[PDB]
Design a protein around this ligand. Structure first.
Ligand SMILES: COc1ccc(-n2nc(C(F)(F)F)c3c2C(=O)N(c2ccc(C4(CN5CCCC5)CC4)cc2)CC3)cc1
Ligand SMILES: [Ca+2]
Lengths: 52, 234
């Protein structure tokens, strides 16, 4: 099911390349070492409600 | 916004408000980055001279986090038609960069395929604005937000008196008294996915506000992502 199965465990963008799941992130985020989570590169990342 | 709730502190940081000569808000917009505002093309004919205010939640007083920005370049979509409101999309290049802080931050631009397959297939999205709280009422002084469900494409075509093109989608309620409204146009329609909010639409139009058998019409952002990318480089 890849991407069709819970977004392929990706935090954000999910692509099916060569019958394999490939995750990516929006501008301002860095794909984490596990290749799934998205890490904000700096303060006030897009899509995040301001808490502090 | 008809119904919904007030946007609480920091809940809608990507909301922008276009103000006219007398500092009156007449439309909304979505912060895309430090120099770009996303809005609706028809909003451009709603005022001669206008600026963009960010970080505002209560137009009645001076909080402290507000900031006005002059527009440097207005990038309207040339296919926009006043008759059907098709291609209702425009991008604004600001003269000075927005300083992100509490209540001021950009919403994320998603990728097309993923957005259409994962974002727009969810039950709801979120719309927000300073628009009317009733169809006959006056502009809201408080910023509002409202969860609006995605409406089946076939059903909305049957509900509409006007053509629903491929560049737009419907959201809202059949009979429930909640919907966007005059003043919210050009404003944000975002979809939340794992705590992150992605821009999915632009408040475009509607036959009245929150009427029975009628839905809210939004510009389909996934149909203009490439156009948006290009617009943010000129
Ligand atoms: C979910 O977001 C919104 C929902 C409703 C409104 N909204 N409130 C009001 C008011 F408060 F004034 F009632 C109005 C509107 C609105 O959008 N109108 C409208 C604008 C354009 C169109 C056309 C055809 N028109 C072009 C000219 C020929 C007929 C299809 C393109 C049809 C209808 C009516 C007045 C704004 C945002
Ligand atoms: Ca204020």
């Amino acid at each position: 099911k890849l991407c069709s199965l819970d977004n392929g465990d990706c935090d954000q963008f999910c692509h099916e390349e060569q019958n394999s799941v490939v995750c990516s992130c929006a501008r301002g985020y860095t794909l984490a070492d596990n290749g799934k989570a998205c890490i904000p590169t700096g303060p006030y990342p897009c899509g995040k409600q301001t808490l502090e | 916004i008809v119904g919904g709730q007030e946007c609480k502190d920091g809940e809608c940081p990507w909301q922008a408000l276009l103000i006219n000569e007398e500092n009156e808000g007449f439309c909304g917009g979505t912060i895309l980055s430090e120099f770009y505002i996303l809005t609706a093309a028809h909003c451009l004919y709603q005022a001669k001279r206008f600026k963009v205010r960010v970080g505002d939640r209560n137009t009645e007083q001076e909080e402290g986090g507000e900031a006005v920005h002059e527009v440097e370049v207005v990038i309207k979509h040339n296919r926009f038609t006043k008759e059907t409101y098709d291609f209702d999309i425009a991008v604004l290049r600001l003269k000075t960069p927005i300083t992100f802080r509490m209540n001021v931050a950009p919403a994320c631009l998603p990728e097309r395929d993923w957005a259409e397959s994962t974002l727009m297939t969810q039950k709801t999205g979120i719309v927000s604005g300073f628009g009317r709280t009733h169809e006959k009422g006056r502009q809201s002084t408080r910023l509002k937000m409202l969860e609006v469900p995605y409406v089946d494409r076939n059903s909305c075509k049957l509900s509409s008196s006007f053509i629903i093109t491929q560049n737009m989608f419907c959201a809202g309620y059949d009979t429930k008294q909640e919907d966007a409204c005059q003043g919210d146009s050009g404003g944000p329609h975002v979809t939340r996915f794992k705590d992150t909010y992605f821009v999915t639409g632009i408040v475009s139009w509607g036959e009245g506000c929150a009427r029975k058998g009628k839905y809210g019409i939004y510009t389909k952002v996934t149909a203009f992502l490439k156009w948006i990318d290009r617009s943010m480089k000129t």
